[PDB]
């Protein structure tokens, strides 16, 4: 009977590998990777404080053979660790959404980790509040908890998590499409790129502006990296009366925007979704139009950065999908036995025993996803 005894080691090993890699290599200390280390330590703590004695309870026939002092402490630890594990993914999703949506100050982590850990602690507080002790957390004494704690641990995070998770993808998709149409060789490119990015409307104004030319020149001077190449391209486009001149002007402007460290993460995220070939062709056309002899080494850097954003999204989606596939049955049945009229208690309690053990296996699979997708 070594089936579950051995599984403990992969969980702890994968969690401690994530603990060490983020704090040692220094090549992977991105903003989200700090949340990954908190999730890793949370899943490492369940390896030594949840799995061993819970599986030892099997030999005791659901009885507590240890000192009775720590039993409420153990239940508190279990609830705290599950809540932290879910809320860390929730925090990752909401952080990604808020960073992509409003990168003005994000571009220019311990506090967020403390916030989520304190929230989980304040979620798990009520648990401390002849015959022998039997820690099974009976539905009678812990009645309101089985509903409220389950709602606050699974349903409350899963609502926002799903939305925030997609909210980020939405922005990428918005750009992807807008950018593909901008590289499709009509003045519909700007009308969509304006909403995709959020100066952009000034380009559609050009396709004209008698007094907005000063503002346009000021905006062009607002990008020092492109310097006066953008201004020269704008003057040429004004002289050449749009046609292909406006096309290479907007291509150069998009390349310069992707060059700015303010919009670079968002634009790389949008590029992550899409054919990734038409976008490269358009960016290369912009680089050629912009002069900029080092342009190729920059557009290739942009495309390399875009792949990174994409890679992350994939590794994240999988983890989330697993979380949803594995934890959901347990929390679904944990509400069924609270509200019933003829449901046999044994028939629902048998499935809860396997379902609670199923949810904890997700601790040892998140590092596996990273290792496989690295
Ligand atoms: C005998 N034991 C089975 C059990 C085994 C293992 Cl290995 C872990 C936990 C339990 N076990 C028991 N009773 N409870 C639990 C926990 C703790 C409460 C949790 O409920 C939650 C969890 C998070 C948020 C809200 N409620 C269900 C899992 C009875």
Beta strand spans in the chain (E): none
Domains of the chain: 8-172+312-373 (1.20.1070.10), 179-307 (no CATH)
CA distance 132 to 100: 55
Give me ligand 1 centre to Cα 82, in Å: 9
CA 189 to chain centre: 29
DSSP labels, 191-233: HHHHHHH--HHHHHHH---SSTHHHHHHHHHT-TTTTTHHHHH
Name the structure determination technique. Answer: cryo-EM
User: Is residue 136 within 6 Å of ligand 1 at its C-beta?
Assistant: yes
The number of residues in the chain equals: 374
User: Which residues, in sequence order, are CB contacts of 183 under 8 Å at separation 6+?
Assistant: 251, 278, 279, 281, 282
User: Is residue 54 within 6 Å of ligand 1 at its C-beta?
Assistant: yes
CA distance 84 to 158: 13
* C-alpha separations of 351 from 190, 329, 367 in Å: 56, 9, 27
Q: Tell the residue number behind the tokens 């992509």, with chain if given.
A: 100
Yes or no: say if 16 and 23 are a contact pair by the CB < 8 Å rule: no
194 is in an annotated binding site: no
Nearest one of 267, 235, 248, 262 to 189, comparing CA atoms:
248
CA dihedral 205, 210, 212, 213 (to 10 degrees): 100
Residue 361 CA neighbour count, 13 Å, CB half:
16
Nearest one of 261, 271, 259 to 193, comparing CA atoms:
271
Yes or no: say if 18 and 40 are a contact pair by the CB < 8 Å rule: yes
Q: What is the CA radius of gyration of the chain?
A: 27
* The pair of three-digit structure tokens given for residue 269, joined into one six-digit string: 């995220």
Q: Mutual orientation of helices 244-259 and 264-272 as an angle, nearest 10°?
A: 110
Give me ligand 1 centre to Cα 149, in Å: 11
Nearest-atom index, ligand 1, CA of 78: 17
* C-alpha separations of 300 from 56, 258, 281 in Å: 55, 12, 11
């Amino acid at each position: 009977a070594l089936l579950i005894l051995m599984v403990i080691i992969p969980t702890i090993g994968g969690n401690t590998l994530v603990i060490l890699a983020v704090s040692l290599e220094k090549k992977l200390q991105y903003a989200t990777n700090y949340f990954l280390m908190s999730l890793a330590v949370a899943d490492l703590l369940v390896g030594l404080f949840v799995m061993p004695i819970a599986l030892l309870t099997i030999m005791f026939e659901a009885m507590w053979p240890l000192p009775l002092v720590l039993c409420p402490a153990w239940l508190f630890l279990d609830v705290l660790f599950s809540t932290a594990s879910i809320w860390h993914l929730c925090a990752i999703s909401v952080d990604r959404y808020i960073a992509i949506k409003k990168p003005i100050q994000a571009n220019q982590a311990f506090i967020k980790i403390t916030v989520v850990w304190l929230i989980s602690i304040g979620i798990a507080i009520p648990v401390p509040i002849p015959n022998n002790i039997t820690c099974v957390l009976t539905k009678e004494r812990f009645g309101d908890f089985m509903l409220f704690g389950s709602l606050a641990a699974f349903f409350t995070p899963l609502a926002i998590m799903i939305v925030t998770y997609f909210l980020t993808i939405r922005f990428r998709r918005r750009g992807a499409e807008a950018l593909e149409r901008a590289f499709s060789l009509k003045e519909a490119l700007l009308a969509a790129l304006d909403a995709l990015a959020e100066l952009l409307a000034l380009l559609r104004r050009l396709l004209l502006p008698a007094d907005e030319l000063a503002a346009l020149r000021a905006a062009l001077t607002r990008f020092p990296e492109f310097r006066e190449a953008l201004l020269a391209l704008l003057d040429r486009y004004l002289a050449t009366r749009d046609l292909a001149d406006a096309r290479d002007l907007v291509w150069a402007l998009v390349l310069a925007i992707a060059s700015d460290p303010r919009y670079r993460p968002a634009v790389a995220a949008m590029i992550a979704f899409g054919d990734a070939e038409v976008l490269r062709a358009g960016l290369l056309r912009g680089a050629e139009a912009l002069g900029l002899p080092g342009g190729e080494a920059l557009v290739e850097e942009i495309m390399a950065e875009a792949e990174n954003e994409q890679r992350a999204s994939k590794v994240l989606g999988i983890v989330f999908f697993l979380f949803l596939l594995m934890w959901c049955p347990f929390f679904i049945t944990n509400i069924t036995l609270v509200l019933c009229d003829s449901c046999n208690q044994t028939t629902l309690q048998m499935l809860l025993e396997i379902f609670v053990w199923i949810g904890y296996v997700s601790s040892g699979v998140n590092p596996l996803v990273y290792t496989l997708f690295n």
